[PDB]
Amino acid sequence: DDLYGTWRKAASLKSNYNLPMHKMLNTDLSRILKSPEIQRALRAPRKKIHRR
Amino acid sequence: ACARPLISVYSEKGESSGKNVTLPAVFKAPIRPDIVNFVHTNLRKNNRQPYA
Amino acid sequence: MKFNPFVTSDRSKNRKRHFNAPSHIRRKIMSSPLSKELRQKYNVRSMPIRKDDEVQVVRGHYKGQQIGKVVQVYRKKYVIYIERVQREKANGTTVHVGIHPSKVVITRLKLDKDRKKILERKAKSRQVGKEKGK
Amino acid sequence: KTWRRWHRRVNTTQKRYAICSALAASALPALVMSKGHRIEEVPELPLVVEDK
Amino acid sequence: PSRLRKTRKLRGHVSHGHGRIGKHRKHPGGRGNAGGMHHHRINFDKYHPGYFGKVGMRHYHLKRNQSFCPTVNLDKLWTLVSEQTRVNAAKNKTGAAPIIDVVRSGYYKVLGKGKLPKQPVIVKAKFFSRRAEEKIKGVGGACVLVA
Amino acid sequence: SAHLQWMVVRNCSSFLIKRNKQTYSTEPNNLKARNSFRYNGLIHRKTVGVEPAADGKGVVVVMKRRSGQRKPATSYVRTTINKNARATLSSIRHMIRKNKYHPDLRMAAIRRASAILRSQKPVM
Amino acid sequence: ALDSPKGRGTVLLSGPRKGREVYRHFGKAPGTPHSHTKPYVRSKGRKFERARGRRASRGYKN
RNA sequence: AAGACCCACUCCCCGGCGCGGGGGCCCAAGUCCUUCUGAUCGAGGCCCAGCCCGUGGACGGUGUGAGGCCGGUAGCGGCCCCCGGCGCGCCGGGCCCGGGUCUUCCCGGAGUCGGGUUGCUUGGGAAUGCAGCCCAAAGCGGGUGGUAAACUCCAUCUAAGGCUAAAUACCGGCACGAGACCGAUAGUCAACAAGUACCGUAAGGGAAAGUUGAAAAGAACUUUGAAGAGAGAGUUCAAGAGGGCGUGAAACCGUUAAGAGGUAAACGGGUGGGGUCCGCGCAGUCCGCCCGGAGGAUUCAACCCGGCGGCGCGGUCCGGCCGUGCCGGCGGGGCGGAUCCCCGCUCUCGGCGGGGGACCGCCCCCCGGCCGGCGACCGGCCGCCGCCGGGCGC
RNA sequence: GAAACACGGACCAAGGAGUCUAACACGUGCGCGAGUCGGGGGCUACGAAAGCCGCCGUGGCGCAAUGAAGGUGAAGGCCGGCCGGCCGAGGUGGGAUCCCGAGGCCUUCCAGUCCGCCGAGGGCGCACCACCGGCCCGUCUCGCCCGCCG
RNA sequence: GCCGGGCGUGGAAUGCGAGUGCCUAGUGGGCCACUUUUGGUAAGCAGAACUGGCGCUGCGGGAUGAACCGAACGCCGGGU
RNA sequence: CCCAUACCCGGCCGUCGCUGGCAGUCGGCAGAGCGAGAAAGAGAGGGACGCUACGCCGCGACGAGUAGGAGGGC
């Protein structure tokens, strides 16, 4: 915690360094997709195959 | 991560000691294989000895 | 691992120094282990092999429990000739088959003034390793 | 020729990035198994032992 | 990485990507910047106008340190001092203006490009532009020269 | 996370073997042993493994408990089932369905247990 | 995505795409009438493309 | 520099004697049980010490592949020589030496500078440098002050005599270490009796050429022949390794077998015939469920005890723990800040530098309160459910 | 324009030809971002590596241009009596997206709300493009004024 | 030139998604034919215009064939 | 009446396009749907396969090539 620091506290053993920031917080997109907030905003899944 | 877990320190003979350490923030940094790979294949050239 | 920067670990350099070692260095490379009954009597692991030393072959086609003295130490070929370790040639004469000393255990030594002073030194410095470590 | 460009330089922040991604992946058991390390009996993955 | 280069894909194709009619010869047009006035005239006049000729006076022994004069615009004049000063100046009711010494920060001339926040300053500089002075006064500051 | 760790090991894994235009994963708890996101045996929080019993008779069902996720020495719970064929399948069917424990893998687990039980019976 | 799945109540913004220094070199070539396009010079100064193609005193200009 | 006046120690340097670096020799532990092999360094094992050593698991040797057979490797390991070092003490020596103030004196490098000119050189442009020829100095002078010249102020050095370590260079030499290099048409021309053989009057030019086997055990002897060469025999795991001998490709050739043959051969597409081998084909599918009759177990459901697991909207259980959340502070500290009394110094008061202290910000900690999570991260109860084990059930 | 009375080629094996360095340009990937970068230098077997050093960012490139040069060096409007207050960073057209909503979205019948959806029309308008103004430097023309130590 | 407002039966047919910016190789010997056409007695000659070919292209036909006529090509079965 | 690699029907391969579809494997905490010409709500007061999403799947159209360019090479 002093060689790289937390995100709210820069490193104490590096001159000016702090951990890189995440590009997305919740990487669990399985728990995201089946969350209610998203399911309400989705059209019906068209899953009937129409062959020639 | 919102909350960081509490790692337990183990004695020299295997069983868990009473002491615990908070998981440092660096273990929650983003995993970037493309960066680790890029840094590896470039830093690993620096120990090369010339031939001609 | 070795850390001495002046000691090589090159394959070609070690093989060149081995196959071109002078005679007094050939002697050292051609050392043999002592028997168990001799190893705790002198507290010495191994020893360069002389011309008249009782010997057992442990590896190869001539291995067995027979004791045989050395007859010559052919240092140029990195090999020794043991008295009964021989094979038949075509024309009925026998020839000493050569055995490598590393594949030979010494069962009795050819003691003399110079030989004894070697055994005690190999035993003196051996104790230093046990009096400094413990 | 000997003056071929043998060595490479990487940005210091990119080097520090990779060490953060390397350590952060050492805390995921699925990634350490996938590296082939037989660690199926280790008590806790961020293995910490006392200073003894 | 030669395994990604184009020559790996050109193995087996005779001309190696340089055509059969117009072979890849040594130097078909001359070496370097040759023919700048004769057969490469169009290229030099279409992409490097002004290349040929002399213009202006010569300065024999030029020392860049004499003409050294880094400039700073008024838009980032407040970035030289810490934010604590900029907020204590507006919070202050006495009317005391903070002093912003640019030559200490590394600039000599002050140019008036941006807009200034309405609170007085005391800009210590080596040179000023006319607009830079006019903007500083309008905010209520003062232009202090130094050498 | 699950989806994060998959993006790391989907191509670079010691358990991965790719040859003859086929891709396989030999990781310990991968029933159907294919390199997939569903059947991967290390990525998820809840995993089901079915391996032959040590004695050669029966199957071992391996469920992954949810408490200790970064503690591999206690993460997996192993139970041995040495009943007849029909009840052995009926047990693991209950252990997955009635527990709501990774239900997309019940039939895959019944297939695998059925293949292990069929191998253990005396070959003719 | 959780707060606004359909993007309702958002303002989609973009940076200045042609703000890169490269686009000053693009367009009609320099040395063309009214083609105020930055040329490629290794350094700027009185003796780097200030001559013949630029002064009316030296030949012509555009 | 000398004199005068104060001030200050009088101790260094030469010539003799005594009290870490190079070489040599050594230092851990399996040839332990079974089993492969021509040979094991292979394979398996060595429980409770899952053999033994390990500051030694570099490398090489050894009849394949060796931490423990050997040399070594590791060690702020040992021993013994040699080289100078480092002070100490003695003797013979040279050794009287400085600083400040005041007064009085002294002080500089010439066929050189500079100028003209010619030629070279330079980024140096009305000439940067160098050289020849001619001219040829000065002393408040001389040189420089990147545009020729005059005048006038400044600035700046002191040419034409000399010495001087370190940082720096090193395709030769001596001695070492290493490599994402080459692997015998490659790498040096040269892995070898290579600058050799050989060529040229000479200057010079300049190759090709590594490998039997673990070990010569290098084929005794018989037999045909003048002999080279064969046939036996023998050696070896192997002669299908027999002295230019590992592997032994292609072109080319011999022979054997098969097929074919007057539009040179070869080719594409389509079939047919014949071979070669293979399918180990030669009486042809199993897999569920149901029914039927023959059999055989310790056998089902349901309950009982025990263990484990899953989940809980327990509508909101209790307690921990954490926060990339926040607030509260008669808080505690560490810093950060271009936010504002003391000591020191140069001219008791003003100026300067340092140290507080105050404030702000941040972080850490002691709390208190919330908010959330523990599905990136928890325990106990409670309930439901599942599984396993053991009983019964027969 | 080659089956050519065009040239190379009897046959086999092995060797055998777009490379490296520097510079530049554009595209692309990554890190940081009005900054960025230690490359040089220091500090602490593999390791000649790696790590660290900003009171090692000197310096490079970027953040300002223009003129040969001396040089200069990047919005304004209104109100009140050249001064004092206020508003203070262009506009037009086209613009992906967002916003509003006239209305309109079934079980025995109406009344009947919340949510969700649709939509005439109307808006704020990203980037970018076209155009019109504005500002800085050079230069020209025409003028009126101001300022103070000399 | 500016504002503001009102007008949509989208004001011929047919077809079709468009616009736009970077970087850029090869080429810069051509040849042939219908029609038009210049020099020439003429030429499988020299030189142009227009379109299409050949070059870069096989296939069916013209016995043969760079260019003529038909027609342009993934690998196949049937039909025409 | 004969036949081309042209045209028609069918199979297969590939490319391109739809910037197509699929996270809904939503299971006694269950209810098995979005092929439907018509702006918008099946709205409240014990059960095969699958989904290396860089994957899988469905429709269409298309395929000559030197010099040259690019992509993909389990």
PDB file of C-alpha atoms (C1' of nucleotides) in Angstrom, chain G residues 20 23, chain I residues 26-30, chain J residues 21:
ATOM      1  CA  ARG G  20      -5.281  17.035 -34.702  1.00  0.00           C
ATOM      2  CA  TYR G  23      -5.359  18.145 -40.721  1.00  0.00           C
TER       3      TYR G  23
ATOM      4  C1'   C I  26       0.409   8.611 -42.565  1.00  0.00           C
ATOM      5  C1'   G I  27      -2.429   4.583 -40.414  1.00  0.00           C
ATOM      6  C1'   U I  28      -2.961   1.585 -36.155  1.00  0.00           C
ATOM      7  C1'   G I  29      -2.343  -0.344 -30.764  1.00  0.00           C
ATOM      8  C1'   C I  30      -1.040   1.216 -25.612  1.00  0.00           C
TER       9        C I  30
ATOM     10  C1'   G J  21     -10.939  12.246 -46.152  1.00  0.00           C
TER      11        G J  21
END
